[PDB]
Amino acid sequence: VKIGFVVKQPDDPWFQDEWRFAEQAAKDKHFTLVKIAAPSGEKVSTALDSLAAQKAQGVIICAPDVKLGPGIAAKAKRYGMKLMSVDDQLVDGRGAPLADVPHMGISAYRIGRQVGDAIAAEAKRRGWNPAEVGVLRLAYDQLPTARERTTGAVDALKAAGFAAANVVDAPEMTADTEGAFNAANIAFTKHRNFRHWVAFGSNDDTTVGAVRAGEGRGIGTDDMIAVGINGSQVALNEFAKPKPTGFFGSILLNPRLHGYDTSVNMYDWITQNRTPPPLVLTSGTLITRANEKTARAQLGL
Ligand SMILES: OC[C@H]1O[C@@H](O)[C@H](O)[C@@H](O)[C@H]1O
Structure with a gap:
């Protein structure tokens, strides 16, 4: 066999x-x-x-x-x-x-809800006003599982008081770190008004792309809460860094x-x-x- x-x-x-x-x-x-x-x-x-x-x-x-x-x-x-x-x-x-x-x-939609809930909880712990937070949605909507993951995250965030008007779509050319890095940079340039951000994508790889892009623009760990999906080595690499990064958590599969x-x-x-x-x-x-x-x-x- x-x-x-x-x-x-x-x-x-x-x-x-x-x-x-x-x-x-x-x-x-x-x-x-x-x-x-x-x-x-x-x-x-x-x-x-x-x-x-x-x-x-x-x-x-x-x-x-x-x-x-x-x-x-x-x-x-x-x-x-x-x-x-x-x-x-x-x-x-x-x-x-x-x-x-x-x-x-x-279970993509439910996983996405978990992403948004995790983000909302950490924002609350920090005393962030959720109505003023930029919501970076790294999008690869042509793939249903990716669309469902990000939709769940957005829905959970709106349910927690994040504003629909502050959801910034960041469509990716490719569903990978490079695609996310490029899409995030485009979004940050257009929305310089936000002090605090949250971010998420379809997986850890895309999520980390947004975290790296933010770092390049002076949006570091105090001003960024990003949560991925997979909980594999991309998440673990962020968790092992001597100085924590804006990659806060991941949904472990x-x-x-x-x-x-x-x-x-x-x-x-x-x-x-x-x-x-x-x-x-x-x-x-x-x-x-x-x-x-x-x-x-x-x-x-
Ligand atoms: O089923 C989970 C997997 O889904 C894929 O679409 C994605 O590329 C992987 O990184 C992983 O998240």
């Missing part, structure tokens, strides 16, 4: 974490894992070709463009590979999810579920024809400098 695990962004430690747990599944269940990075449609196509050359019987993929769904499905079928998605759900030409592809991702449980679901689908769960939406909890080590250890991460 051989299973492919194809990821859009190998330089995001979340996917490295999925891979590490998928490797644990491989050793445990006695299958061979083939790890492939595919940050573009061209590289997805070659990844699936490689997996077929190696006689893999299944592939789990977080595609770089969810609209590649139909092509991915057609090739996997041609090559006799069962197909499962992780993180980013594959969709058809009208943006409807592929009904025959089992998926595991996060569980890459054992996304890496180990998906791989087992695939294994059992291949070997026993067990119907995979069609949709699993996972949960998270807030980590900050104060609890990150404990929280991660209590998940075995």
